[PDB]
Amino acid sequence: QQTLPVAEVAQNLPKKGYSPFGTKQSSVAEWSLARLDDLLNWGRKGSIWPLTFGLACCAVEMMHIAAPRYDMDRYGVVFRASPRQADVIIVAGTLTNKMAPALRKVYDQMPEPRWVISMGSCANGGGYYHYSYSVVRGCDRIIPVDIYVPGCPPTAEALMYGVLQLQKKVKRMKTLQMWYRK
Amino acid sequence: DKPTVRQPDAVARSHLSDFGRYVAECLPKYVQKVQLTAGDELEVLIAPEGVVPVLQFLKDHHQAQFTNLVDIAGVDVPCRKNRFEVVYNLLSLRYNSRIRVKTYTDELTPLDSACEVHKAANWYEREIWDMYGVFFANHPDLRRILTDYGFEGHPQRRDFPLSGYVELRYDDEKKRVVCEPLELAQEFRKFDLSAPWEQFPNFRNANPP
């Protein structure tokens, strides 16, 4: 595994910079799109609206992320009810067969760009009920998953770390910069 | 003198023993057997037809007043000819006691619903039909309560595979979830948890023919 740089070696490395695309763009047009691409990502990154799914006993720890101790809202994360206004879905709990068509539909109704987070073992791979006769073995069978948060339930910080991974994943989208090459 | 062993509650044992006999005289037609469990809990084994009568008797009689019906558990035992057993757990608030009524039924034979006596058994009976497949005659509207819509079979019978026969997946051709024959990445690994040496000698000769 790639280990972190030592202090002395890191003592020379240049400051990272904010944009993951750097300021090394050859042309003006490319550079403007790169900077303009950051503006989109800065927007979507800032305000990520979950859907308030809350299926099973991960759902309780999905409340304590909104509790004052950790305060999801500090990061611009605001819970919402309608899937139209919701941007992210946190599938937290055991997605049984009876639910499975309902999650698919609710996910479909969510407008793009939509990212899915899988909370806990139940939604990751079927978890403790993996072999049950009425459990979908992981929600990735039904909807694409963008971040997997392990745990049972994941700690509140663990989910917070998951959300920040989604911000970083959002931060590095190349929606515009890849249109130029296309 | 020995702390680890649980201390039996003799006073509660004494009352249940005598009242256990009392039921046997009042309901000879139905009460097949009455036995006091090792947990100092009373069990009343009745014939299949005596469900509604016996339940009515325990709820309405002055001495019983088992007003509160707590559960209806179903047990599947393929060995027996009437493989399905149904157990009622009743509570008597006035007398502060619990009694169990058991009955046996086959795959097909219906079992008289007890919504009348205790209409708390509206859903419990629905569950039993769904999980095991025991039909309850005269029920208001029998219908699956737990399993998926159109789920075929009755999962909690011991003759039903643990993982079921069919999984679900999303098929982007059909734009909907579809059911396929089951296919597990890792099988359920059995473990043979069988002891070769008998440990409880008291039950070796129990239940003579």
Next chain:
Amino acid sequence: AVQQVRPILSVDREEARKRALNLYKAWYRQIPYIVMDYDIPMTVEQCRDKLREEFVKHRNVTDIRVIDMLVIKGQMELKESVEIWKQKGHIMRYWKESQDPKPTDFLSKFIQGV
């Protein structure tokens, strides 16, 4: 080898035959509603065949109690389909569309493997 038993719904095969036909009525009446209220590819004629195809599955059944149970379960689905509690996916579950044909001839199975 006969035994005394408690009837389920009917007492005679003729009554059982009578009940089963009613279930065919109610389904055959209901197909036009199911097509409208479900976003599924199948048409009324296709479905009306599926009703015929499956009532034929239980062609050799003889015991009245078994026929009663098939009619109890058969009726339960119709109520769950007369209502739209069953979702779009469940209705099409009667066709097994996702599962592709498995050849039956020996040579094809052998080449395909077990």
Next chain:
Amino acid sequence: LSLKLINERVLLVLKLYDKIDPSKLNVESHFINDLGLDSLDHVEVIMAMEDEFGFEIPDSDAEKLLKPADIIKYVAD
């Protein structure tokens, strides 16, 4: 009551019905023996006939119907 109008309707149902031939399409023809229709098919016809006539035949009324003669007479009601 308008027997010819009734007769042509009843026999139209059969011809309009598929899995049947217009041969032997007489009033005396027997559904399950002469016409040789499955007992399911039999239900399909008569209960399709209710659509053209706009009636509603209970089973105990529907069971009697064994021939177009039985139907056409019963239809007269």
Next chain:
Amino acid sequence: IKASTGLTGLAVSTNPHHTLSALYGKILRAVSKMPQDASYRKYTEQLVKQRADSVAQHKDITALEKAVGCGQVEELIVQAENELILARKMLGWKPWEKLVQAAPAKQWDWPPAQIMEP
């Protein structure tokens, strides 16, 4: 008069002495129709006398409840309304007869599925 029964949906009773007396009177008539050797007839007939006399013996409902225990007078009525239903229903079942269904072999055997050696 009690201000309130203390239980939601249970109303204070006017003339509980009369209502109980009628109910106990009715029960003894329904029980009378049962065969003499029926053990249920022997017990309720013995019991209802013990409740019935106390109802007439005492004229103060608070004293009545102590004399009988077994809950408030309102509940005493609620109880009495049941054995009418039980006693009436049980004249149809005839439970005193012999065991309706002889138990099958091994139908109450635990633990199950063991070879039995003759």
Next chain:
Amino acid sequence: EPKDIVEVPKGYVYVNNKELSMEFADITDRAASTMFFGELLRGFAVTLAHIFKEPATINYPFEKGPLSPRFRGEHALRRYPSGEERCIACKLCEAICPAQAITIEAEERADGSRRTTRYDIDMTKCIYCGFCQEACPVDAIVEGPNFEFSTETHEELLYNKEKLLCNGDKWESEIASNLQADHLYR
């Protein structure tokens, strides 16, 4: 104070038992609140008061925790100070795992020591119960302190032995400190 509609026995507390007084001194008191929003007034004082408290939020990730040494997190196969792996493929952990999340295949090593050629944990099936670390007779498998290992792919959540061993080296210092401060209880 008004009276109680139902007399209270011993060892019981009632929530709505006191009746409502009908003296003008009290009716006016109820009327005044019902008429000038008196009940809601104190409700507004309370909520405003909370403006003047330090909020209990933590500036994660710069500040975080607190936890305890017993915390159950990501797994890791420890090894002896010599460097040799502790696990001897006894398979107690596999047999006790409620989720059957563990798969082990063992073989007589070249030097002849009982050891594993395979040790896989399916982190999407584990429940972090901790029975594996209680059953291990040589403390080979432990639930390390780490709880920040979310991935972007399902496959990356299936740990094989090399991944587990790497964790047992990255996290070795902290695990050895938790075991020392906690083994006596266990």
